[PDB]
Design a protein around this ligand. Structure first.
Ligand SMILES: Nc1ncnc2c1ncn2[C@@H]1O[C@H](COP(=O)(O)OP(=O)(O)O)[C@@H](O)[C@H]1O
Ligand SMILES: [Mg+2]
Lengths: 57, 72, 470, 72, 469, 471
C-alpha cells in the first residue's frame, strides 16, 4: 500500500505535467490563430475606412 | 439560457406562468451543474437528483416537426 | 428670405437661400407646404442646419421623414435654433424632439418661455469646487457606489431586473428629500418600453415631477440625436433659475452616438475608426459637459448604457465611459434571488468611494462589505457542489455574515407600496453605515437569515425578526 | 499619417539639457487610457515606442485592493 | 529657369509648381531659403524630396523638417539631384542628420567636399561577389555558432540592458582593428537620449574615431526618418567602392524604417496594403537592403535591430525584413545576469552560413556538438532542479560537466570593457575558437575549475588563468 | 448600318459609343472584327456583351476574350441579341466554349441550327415542381446523413485540394450511367487538364453522346467565366423544357462565377461590396442559380462543386449560396488530413430529404444517433486534448470509443480513387449503410480495432479487414 500510494502521487504528478504540456501547446497554436485573426481584423478595418474615404472624393 | 424574452410573463397565461416559473429554475440549475459532470469525481445524490430533473426537463422540451401543442 | 430645396438624400436635405441671408449653423428651418394638387403630399418638417456648403447652399438634417419632398419647396428660416418650452409648464408632460406634447392634454401657448437647445457648457469659474454626494436613500447606492451631486451614472441593466422601478424611485426620493425635479429623456429605444415607463409614471405618481421627452427608434437620426439635448435643455431651466438639484435620465446614451454616426455618413464626412463619425467625442462632450454642478444648482445624470455585443473597446462606449463617475450594474441573479434593487454590489463601482469624499468610517465599512462579498462570491462553486459541511469554518462565518449583508442591501421602495403594501423607506447614509457596521461586527448573527429582506434601517431588522417570534 | 509624428515632436521636447545650455530639464508624464487593458492598439503602441519606459496601472490589481495598482 | 511656386502646404506634404519642361525628377532635393521681408513672416530653411508628378506642372513633395511658416508663393530652389550627402574621411567621427549636415558643434563641412547622391540603384548582377565568405568578428559566440557574412544582413534581437550597444561597439573595434574597415551607425527613428548615450559611449571608448553616425530621430517628420538608413548607407558605400574595404552598417530598429515608410505613404494618399503597411513595403525594403551587398571591390555587412511588433514574426514588417536576413544573434537577459558577456543566446541564434560547404567540416561539427551539448544541458536543467545535481547518470553528469565549461567559455573580455574591468580584451580568430571548443568537447580541460573559463579569450589563456588561480 | 467606336479599354472592360438612339439593350452581344491594316495592328475577333449604360450614347461592356490589341476608335458591330448558343440534339457529344462554338475538332455547327439566347428570366412560382425523392449515390455519408434529391440542387462545399473534384467524378461514375437521361457538364474556372481527363473518361465510359460539355477554364478572362455556366444552363433547360427530359447538370466551381464577377466589378465603376466582392454578389448569383430548377416539364438535378476561399465558410460567396441549395456536403481539411475520404463534415452537411417521411423511420433514427454521438465527441474534444481519455465518466469513454468507429466508417474507398491508392472501390446501397451504422451503434463491433474501419465499403468488409489485421 505504501508503494501504491507513492506510485499514485507519481502518476498524478506525471498526469498534471502532461496536462500542462498539452495546455501550453494549445496556447501556442491559439496565439498563431490570434495573430492571423488580428492581422485580418486590421487589414479589414483599414480597407473599410479607406473605401469610405474614397467613396466621397 | 441565452434566449431572452423582454415582455415575458406578461405574455403568458396564469397557468403557464405558475409552472414555467419553476421550469426555468430547474433548467437553470441543470445548466449550472452539468458543467461539473463532464469528467472527474461523481457529484453527490442531491446534485445528481437535480441533474436527472434537468435531463427530463430537456426531454420534455423536445418536439417534432409541424405538430404544435395547444396551451392546455 | 426664403430658400428652396435642392436635394433630398434620405434624412438630409440641401437648401439654397438667397445671397447674404444664410442661416447660422444649428438653426431650425421649417417647411409648411400645402399640396397644390392630387400629385403632391402635405409635408411638415423641421430642418436643422448642420453645415454650410459652397454657393449659398445649406446642408440640413430633418427631424421627421423627408418622403414627399419636392425639389423647389420653400423653406422658412426661424432665425433661431430649436426652441424648447421650459418651466413649470413642462412638468407632468411628454414632449417631442421639437418641444411639442405627444399626449392629448393640449398644447403650450405661444407666450411661454422657450430656450434654445444649443448652449455652451458652464465655465470653469462657474463650477463647484468640492465634490458633494447626491444622497438617494438607497442602501446599495449610498453604501457601495455613491452618486456625486452633478455627476454621471451608468446603469447596466436589461429587462426583468427593475431598472424602471429604480428610475422612478430615484425620481421619488430626489423630489421628496431634495425638492429636485427629474427629467426623463428617451433617446432612441423601444417605444413599447417608453409606453410602459410612462404608465409606470402614471401609476407610481412620479409623473407630476417628471418632464419626459421621447424620440425613439421610429424617428430619423437627427431627432434621435437631439432628444437628449432637448431633455437637458428642460433640466437646465430648473438648475439655472430654480436652483435645484435636478436628475436627468438618458435611456441608452449609446443611441446618441450612433445617430451621429448615421447622420455624418450622409453629411459628407470621412468615416472615423470603427465606422463612427470623426466628431464623436466632441459632440459627446458638448452634450455631457452641460451636465455639471454649478454654484447655484446641479444636474446629476443617470444614463442607461447598452454596450453593443458587450464590447467595451468599442469607441462609443469608450467615449461614454470617459465621462462616467459611477456604475450601478443591475443583475438578474439578484432579481431572481429576491433582492430588490438588484444592484450587483461587487461590479457597481464609484469614483466617490474614497475617504476624502465619504469619510473614513464609510470607506472602511463599505470596503469590508465588498471584501466579504468578494470572499462569498469566490466560494459559490464550493457551496453549490461540495456543500456547506465541507466549507472549512472561518469561511462558514463569512457565508453566515455575507447572506445577511446581501439581504440587507435590498430596500422596500416607496414606489413598490402599490404592489406590496409595505410603505417604503428613505435611509440616510449615516444610518446605513451604522447598520452595515453592526452587521459586520457580528451583532446580528443570532437573527435569522431573513428579516433583512426588504427593510429600511437596522432597527427594522430586529422588529421584523421579533415579529416572526425571534 | 503623422499621428506618430504628433506625439514624437511633443515628447522629444522633454530633455535634460547639458550644463552648457544652462543645465535645466523638462521631464514629461504622458497618460494613455486603454479600454479593457489592451496595449496592442495604435496610440498605445506609438506612445510606448516613444517614451523612456512605462508604468502599467491594471484594473485587476485596482479591483483586488492593490492601490496604487502599479504592475511591477 | 528652375524657380518654382509653393501651391499647397498640408502637414509634411508640400505641392510645388514649376514651369513646363523644367520639372524636377522624382527623389530630387528642393531647397527653400526664405528670409522674412517684414514682421508678418518667418525665416525658413527647409528642404523637400520630390515624390510624385501630379500634372498641371505641379509636383508633390515630402518635407524633411517643419513646414510652419510656409507661404503659398514662396519660391523654391531646384538642386537638380537627390539629397547629396558628404562622403569620405571627413565623415569619420562625426554625427550627421539626414541632409548630411553635422549635428555636432565641431564645425561645418566645406562646399568643395564630395557629396554622393542618397538614391542609387543597387549594384548589378555582374558586380556582385560569387563566393560567400565569412566576416570574421573575433567574438566567439558570433563566429562559432552564428557566423556572419561579408554582405550579410544580421538581426539583433534584444535591447534594454542585455548588452546591445556593447556588442555593437566591440564589433566596430574588432572590424576596424583586424579587417581595417570602418563602421557607420544609422539610428533610424530612435529617441534622442539613447543617441546621446551611444555618442558618449563611443566618445569615451575611442570607438568613434573609426565610425560615422547618422541620427534621424523621432522629433523629425516621417520623410526625414525614412531616408536615414539611405544616408548612412551612402556613407558606407564610399568606403565599399572607392576604398574597397569591408564596412559595417548599423541600423538601430529597422522597424522604424518600415513604419516611417507607412507614414509617408499615408501622407501621400495611397491605398493601404495588407494590415497597415504601404503597398511598396517589399519594394522599399528591397531598395534599402539590396545595396547592402558584397561586390568585388569590398562589402557592406549590416547588423540590424528588429522590433517584431505584437510578438508576431508573421507581421509583414518582420516578415519582409526576415527575407533579407542571414543570421540572428538573440541577446538574452538570462545570460547577462549569469555573468556571460556577450549575452548571445547560443541555441536561439541561427545562421544561414553555418553549413559545411561555406565554413568547413570541422567548424560545422564542432558547432553542432556545442549546440547539442547545450540543448541537452537545457533539457537536464529540470532533472537537476527536481532531483539534484548528482544521481542522474554518469553520461548526464559528464555532459553537464562539459556543457557548463562550454557555456562559460563562450564569454569574452572585450576591448570596450577594458575601461570598466581593466583586463585588455582579446580578438579570437576562428581557427583558435574551433580548436578550443573541440578540446573542451574532447575532455582535454575537464580537470580545470569552471570559473577560469569565464570571460577569457583563447584556450591558452584559460590554461594560464587556471594555473594562476 | 449603325455601328459603334471603341472609347475606353480597361482590362476586360470596353467602352463602346454608338449613335444617338441606336445603342443596344443590356446584355446584347457586340462583335469586333478588325482586319489589321498595317504593321502596328493585330487581327481581332472579339465578342462584347453590354453591361451598363453610361450616358452620352456610350455603353459599358465586358469582353469575352482577351482585349490585347484593341485600338481606340475601332469599329464595333451590334448584333441585336444576346450571346446566342446553339442547342438541340446537335449538342450531344460535343464540347463547347463560352460562345457556343464547338472546340472538340469534330466539325462546325451549321448556321441554320436553333440558337436560344442566354439571358432569360427565371422560372416563375407556378411552374416549379417540389417533389422530393432520394437520389441514391452509393456513398455512405451522402446516403446516411445528407441524402441527395432527384431533381434538386446539390452543393459540394470545400476548400482547396480537399476532394470535391474527386467527389464530382465519383458522382458522375455512380449516377451518370444509371441516369438514362441527358447530362450537361459546365466547367467554370477549373483546370483545363481536368476537362481533358473528364472528356476522355466520358469517351471511354460511353456517357458521351448523351452528354453536352462546356468548358470555361481558369485560363479564360473573367468575362468568359461569368457566362460559361449560363451557356451550360441554357443547354440543359432546352432539354427539360422543349423535350421534358431528365437532366443531370454538373458545375465544378460555381464559385468562379462570382469571383469572375468580382474581377470585373471594380472596372465597371462599382463601389467595393463586402470584402472585395461586388455589391451585386447576391442578385448576380440569384439570377443564375434560380434558373437551375425542376419544373412541371422536366427536372434538372444539379450537383455543384463550390470553392471556399482560404477555408473560410463565412466568406460571402460561400455564405450566400447555402440558401440556394437543397442538399449540401461540407468538406473539411481537418478530416482530409486525418485520412478520412470523403472528408464530409457529418454535422455541417444537411439535406431537405433527411425527414422520417422520406428516408423512412429507421434511416432517420440511425442518422440522428450517428450525428448525436459525433456531436458529443466534438464536445469532448477539449477534455480529450488536455486531460486525455482517462477522466471521462465511462459513458463518455463509450461515446468516444464508438464515435471513432463511426467517423472512420464514414470514409469510403472510391472507384475514382483507385488511381490514388490501388484499392478498387465500392458502391454501398442505402439499406446496407443504415444496417452497418446501426450495428456499429448497437455495440456489435466494439471489439474490432478502429483502423479496420477506414476506407471500406460495407460492414462485412470491416470484418474481413480486421480479420486480415489479426484480431
Ligand atoms: N476519395 C479519395 N480517396 C483518396 N484520396 C482523395 C480522395 N478524394 C480526394 N483525395 C485527395 O485529395 C486531393 C483533392 O483533389 P481534387 O478533388 O481534384 O481537388 P479539389 O478538391 O481542389 O477540387 C486529390 O489529389 C487526392 O489526392
Ligand atoms: Mg477542383
Amino acid at each position: 500500500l505504501l508503494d501504491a500510494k507513492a506510485s499514485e502521487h507519481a502518476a498524478r504528478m506525471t498526469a498534471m505535467k502532461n496536462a500542462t504540456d498539452n495546455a501550453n501547446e494549445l496556447i501556442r497554436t491559439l496565439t498563431l490563430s490570434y495573430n492571423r485573426a488580428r492581422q485580418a481584423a486590421i487589414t479589414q478595418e483599414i480597407t473599410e475606412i479607406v473605401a469610405g474615404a474614397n467613396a466621397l472624393q | 439560457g441565452l434566449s431572452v424574452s423582454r415582455v415575458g410573463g406578461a405574455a403568458q397565461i396564469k397557468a403557464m406562468k405558475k409552472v414555467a416559473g419553476t421550469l426555468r429554475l430547474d433548467l437553470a440549475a441543470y445548466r449550472e451543474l452539468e458543467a461539473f459532470a463532464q469528467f472527474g469525481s461523481d457529484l453527490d445524490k442531491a446534485t445528481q437528483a437535480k441533474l436527472a430533473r434537468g435531463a427530463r426537463t430537456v426531454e420534455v422540451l423536445k418536439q417534432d416537426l409541424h405538430q404544435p401543442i395547444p396551451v392546455e | 428670405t426664403r430658400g428652396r430645396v435642392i436635394q433630398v438624400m434620405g434624412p438630409v436635405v440641401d437648401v439654397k437661400f438667397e445671397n447674404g441671408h444664410l442661416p447660422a449653423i444649428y438653426n431650425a428651418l421649417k417647411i409648411q407646404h400645402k399640396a397644390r394638387n392630387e400629385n403632391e403630399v402635405d409635408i411638415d418638417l423641421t430642418l436643422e442646419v448642420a453645415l454650410h456648403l459652397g454657393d449659398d447652399t445649406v446642408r440640413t438634417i430633418a427631424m421627421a421623414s423627408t418622403d414627399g419632398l419636392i425639389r423647389g419647396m420653400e423653406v422658412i428660416d426661424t432665425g433661431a435654433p430649436i426652441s424648447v418650452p421650459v418651466g413649470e409648464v413642462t412638468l407632468g408632460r411628454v414632449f417631442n424632439v421639437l418641444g411639442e406634447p405627444i399626449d392629448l392634454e393640449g398644447d403650450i401657448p405661444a407666450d411661454a418661455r422657450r430656450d434654445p437647445i444649443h448652449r455652451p457648457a458652464p465655465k470653469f469659474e462657474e463650477l463647484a469646487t468640492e465634490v458633494e454626494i447626491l444622497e438617494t436613500g438607497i442602501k446599495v447606492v449610498d453604501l457601495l457606489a455613491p452618486y456625486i451631486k452633478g455627476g454621471k451614472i451608468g446603469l447596466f441593466g436589461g429587462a426583468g431586473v427593475g431598472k424602471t422601478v429604480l428610475i422612478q424611485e430615484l425620481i421619488h426620493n430626489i423630489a421628496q428629500e431634495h425638492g429636485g425635479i427629474s427629467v426623463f429623456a428617451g433617446v432612441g429605444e423601444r417605444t413599447r418600453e417608453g409606453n410602459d415607463l410612462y404608465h409606470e409614471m402614471k401609476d407610481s405618481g412620479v409623473i407630476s415631477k417628471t418632464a419626459m421627452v421621447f424620440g425613439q427608434m421610429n424617428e430619423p437620426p437627427g431627432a434621435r440625436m437631439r432628444v437628449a439635448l432637448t431633455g437637458l435643455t428642460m433640466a437646465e431651466y430648473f438648475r439655472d433659475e430654480q436652483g435645484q438639484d435636478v436628475l436627468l435620465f438618458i435611456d441608452n446614451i449609446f443611441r446618441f452616438t450612433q445617430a451621429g454616426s448615421e447622420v455624418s455618413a450622409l453629411l459628407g464626412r470621412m468615416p472615423s475608426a470603427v465606422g463612427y463619425q470623426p466628431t464623436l467625442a466632441t459632440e459627446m462632450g458638448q452634450l455631457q459637459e452641460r451636465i455639471t454642478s454649478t454654484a447655484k444648482g446641479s444636474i446629476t445624470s443617470i444614463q442607461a448604457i447598452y454596450v453593443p455585443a458587450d464590447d467595451y473597446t468599442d469607441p462609443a462606449p469608450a467615449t461614454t465611459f470617459s465621462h462616467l463617475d459611477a456604475t450601478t450594474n443591475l443583475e438578474r441573479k439578484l432579481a431572481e434571488m429576491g433582492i430588490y434593487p438588484a444592484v450587483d454590489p461587487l461590479a457597481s463601482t464609484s469614483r466617490a468611494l474614497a475617504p476624502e469624499i465619504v469619510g473614513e468610517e464609510h470607506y472602511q465599512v463599505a470596503r469590508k462589505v465588498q471584501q466579504t462579498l468578494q470572499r462569498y462570491k469566490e466560494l459559490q462553486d464550493i457551496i453549490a457542489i461540495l456543500g456547506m459541511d465541507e466549507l472549512s469554518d472561518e469561511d462558514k462565518l463569512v457565508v453566515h455574515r455575507a447572506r445577511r449583508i446581501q439581504f440587507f442591501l435590498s430596500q422596500n421602495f416607496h414606489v413598490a407600496e402599490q404592489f406590496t403594501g409595505q410603505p417604503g423607506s428613505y435611509v440616510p447614509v449615516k444610518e446605513t453605515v451604522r447598520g452595515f457596521k453592526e452587521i459586520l461586527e457580528g451583532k446580528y448573527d443570532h437573527l435569522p437569515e431573513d428579516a433583512f429582506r426588504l427593510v429600511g434601517r437596522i432597527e427594522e431588522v430586529v422588529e421584523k425578526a421579533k415579529a416572526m417570534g425571534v | 499619417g503623422d499621428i506618430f509624428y504628433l506625439h514624437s515632436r511633443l515628447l522629444e521636447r522633454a530633455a535634460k539639457l547639458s550644463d552648457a545650455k544652462g543645465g535645466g530639464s523638462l521631464t514629461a508624464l504622458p497618460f494613455v487610457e486603454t479600454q479593457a487593458g489592451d496595449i496592442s492598439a495604435y496610440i498605445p503602441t506609438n506612445v510606448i515606442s516613444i517614451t523612456d519606459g512605462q508604468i502599467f496601472l491594471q484594473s485587476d490589481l485596482f479591483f483586488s485592493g492593490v492601490r496604487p495598482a502599479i504592475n511591477a
